């Protein structure tokens, strides 16, 4: 026989298709649906968060005078914000490719929910910010950490601490690196010490969910229960809008896909949410 | 118009061509700008919407990358650094510009203080070094019209 | 990334995609055999296809 | 750098350069010589279409008449750089010419300078950009029918 | 570019290697070509293009670029970073390539072995010039897969 | 492999490799391919080519490999180089033959890598047959995954 020569897009003729099938892309899990959502018709919000409150009020039987203590709060304001994300498309590309319009829409929707997650976890309140998970949490106690041989053993240890306090827990909001690495763990020669002894679990352990979120500050795990800690007032729900006369459509034959939402996010108190950082 | 005489990049273009740069009447590139319309502007203006990275048309003219979200310029890295480049009425687009490949500025919107490339249809995106072009590490300011380049 | 808080400004945060092209390829092998030999040896007819099928 | 053994004489100035420095274009681009609707030439280096301003036609041939431009400002520029070998000087009835890039001597007529349109004999002149355009701006006094050095 | 010093599959000289800027861009790890040599071919023409003239696209993609019918750039046309080719077609010997501008060495191919011509099969070929443009400043002397300087 | 398609058709061996005066059983020494009669060619006639595996017979004769349901004969199996033919690797039968383990490259059924054997019908094929013995040494040049000289 005799070799054949390869030429791009050649060897018969019959294509009436190019690219098909949904495409995966790097993402991470969200924690946003877990909390409460409520509608609002206001213009802005003021919330209260608790500062330190004492204890005791001892009787005149230890010859002490009763405490007339008054609980304290500091106030937070959140103005309305917009979270949004865009996809930019050429009509020609969308026609020739074939699924692309359907896919572009799923992609714009997933992109906005991702930018939403980003904000909710990591960022300190500026002015253009709402209430963010990483701010509200309680600071790490090094005491809770002790000598381990596994990433999984620390992770079990953080979770239990919250229960002692009588905090609320429902879910683990962890660093992407930390959650995974915790699943992956070894005894020094293999066997995970946070998942079963022949089976792997990455969905739910202890009977609570695990959320792995990227951007939340390196190697930290947070027990909390989302429903109590935050609430999302929604001035207007998610909607796509498209404009062929906008900044970018004018220059080059394009369509602009905008997908937006107007939110506010309220963070009640500093408590019922604890963060612990790994052993020295 | 004969205005725009002497070595101006700060009143030439609609946006800065350079503010700390310099070039003479020395042609180290005699190529035209087919970026920035004239015919509804001054002949001291070019009307340039990017002076950054360029890509060559058919013929011997350079202009801005009008590229989408799934298109991009390959090579042909030039940056525009002209002041007046061998004119007597002030450079206008369709008249001579002298380019370099290390000049300034490099337009960027983004949120700034980061690398930027040009894909300018109103679309700006950042640099990388294996995904998108290697600017060499620089800080380029937010919003086009004023860019201090490192 | 910071999503723009001004809807009078289009998001300068957007996902990026690239296109690829893949041409079709052809893989083959032919094997030439004398049938009588294979038939007398016995498992050979079945083997020769299986070897050819695995190679390809 | 590019070197030439030829000379193309031009009324006013002299042209006898083809070195654009580095970051410039010094690219050997061959093309046919065509005289178009203008007066017939054999060789030479001064005339209607001979030497100067050019815009490429179809078939990789250059002559001068009316803009082929793909822009409302600027357009395609060639110049004829004669190097004696492989090139037959100026515009002439047929004959293989090598051309180059970069604005040099152009032709102007009436009042030259600034933003321009085309005469339609191939010469450039003053007007306001609108389809048509000029390539460079003379630094020197413009007169009628001459090939003008920028 | 514009200094005569070509010859080699990879020169270390100036305007022959970039690595950021200098009339072209290079990444610090390349991007892989889905058109042309990228991995080792032992046959095949690899689609259209074997004379350079590529554009890097977003992520780790290099892709097609070409010139419209009846035209040739007066400017600098894209070429790849200068490679040997131990492969049939492509410029690469199975390396991961980035796009530049002129000043880099390529392989030419065709049915001639005189000065370069322009073809509208989306390639340039070896012919003899007479009305079709030559390719590279040292012309085309190819015996097929000879290193010609652009 | 080089630009515009790699190897095709027949490809040139080594010519006029003259080995003479050997004391052993090698095929390298000037000696005949015999089927019977009196050898080939007149003056000024050029050989053909024939590749395959040959086997030494009685006296200083070689002939083709046949069966394996008959006895194995002579030393190592070898493939024919030229020294009478002016064309490639190969020889015409009834000449003095030098053989080698080089026969590059005239295609014929299967390949010759890692020694060659004779099959039970008489074709030529590569190893490994015996692992407890050493067969005729024909170690081929790289050319695999494609039809070639055995």
TrEMBL record, chains B, D, E, F:
<protein>
    <submittedName>
        <fullName>Gp26</fullName>
    </submittedName>
</protein>
UniProtKB/TrEMBL annotation, chain C:
<protein>
    <submittedName>
        <fullName>Gp27</fullName>
    </submittedName>
</protein>
